[PDB]
Structure formats: C-alpha cells, structure tokens
C-alpha cells in the first residue's frame, strides 16, 4: 500500500514523500510519459514498470509486512503479491537515497508539459 511505501521513502531519504516525490520530473507518481530527467526520475520510472507488472495485486492498496531491522528493509510476507509489491517499494526507496546527491529542487513540482518526447516502453 502507498503509506507503507511512504514510510520506506522517509527512512531512506529523510524527505517528506508526498511533497518531495509525488510531483517530481516526468515519471514520479502519476507521471505519464516523456524522457526521464535524472536518476531520481528514472528511479520513479522503474517503479512504475514494477507496479504495472503487479497490476492484478492492486499495489497501491495492498498492505504487506516489512521491517527496517539493522540498516535494511526486509520484506516479510509469504504470498507473491505482497512479497513483490514490498520489493518494488524497497527498490525505489533505496534508489532515491543513493541518488539524493542530484535531487534537483527545480524538478520537485515540475511542469510536465516540458516533458515532451516519445514515451518509454516498460
């Protein structure tokens, strides 16, 4: 579910998930199309490809089981949907953290009409 995703983002990046990441560049959140802007936008791309692949699981609503024990996020659900959604959410949150060193505040609320250029096959 998205609030679990939100928590993971917080722990890794220390930024507020909705105001930092929901409207970032071309491919964060509801980000339809356009060439990715930077490593962060790309983190967001791969996470969409992650979620679409799990469409049946309803990844935005589906609560799973995870813990941040000893530096790492461990995905502790047994069943596939919950097993894999968590993996996606982790995969992104750690992606953001290691790409903070180029987090660009002028992409935070990016005007997406500037995200022109043919779409990216998942």
Residue 54 sits in a domain whose CATH number is 1.20.90.10
Residue matched to tokens 């995703």: 5
DSSP string, 43-112: HHHHHHHHHHTTGGG-TTT----EEEETTEEEE---SHHHHHHHHHHHHHHHHHHHTGGG--TTSTT--G
CA distance 112 to 51: 21
What is the domain count for the chain?
A: 1
Resolution of this model in Å is 3.0
Residue matched to tokens 């930024």: 15
Q: Among 117, 120, 1, which Cα is nearest to 66's? A: 1
Q: How was this structure determined?
A: X-ray
- Residues spanned by the domain of 82: 1-122
Sign of CA dihedral 69, 85, 17, 42: positive
Task: Give catalytic residue positions.
Answer: 47, 89
- Say if CB 47 and CB 92 are below 8 A apart: yes
CA distance 72 to 118: 37
74, β-bridge pairs: 67
């Amino acid at each position: 579910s998205v609030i679990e995703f939100g928590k993971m983002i917080q722990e890794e990046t220390d930024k507020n998930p909705l105001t930092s990441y929901s409207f970032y560049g071309c491919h964060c959140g509801l980000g339809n199309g356009g060439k990715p802007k930077d490593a962060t936008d790309r983190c967001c791309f791969v996470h969409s490809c992650c979620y679409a692949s799990l469409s049946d699981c309803s990844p935005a609503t589906n609560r799973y089981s995870y813990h941040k024990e000893g530096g790492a996020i461990v995905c502790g659900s047994s069943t596939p949907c919950k097993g894999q959604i968590c993996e996606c959410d982790k995969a992104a949150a750690i992606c953001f953290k290691e790409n903070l060193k180029t987090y660009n505040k002028k992409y935070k609320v990016y005007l997406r009409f500037k995200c022109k250029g043919v779409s990216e096959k998942c």
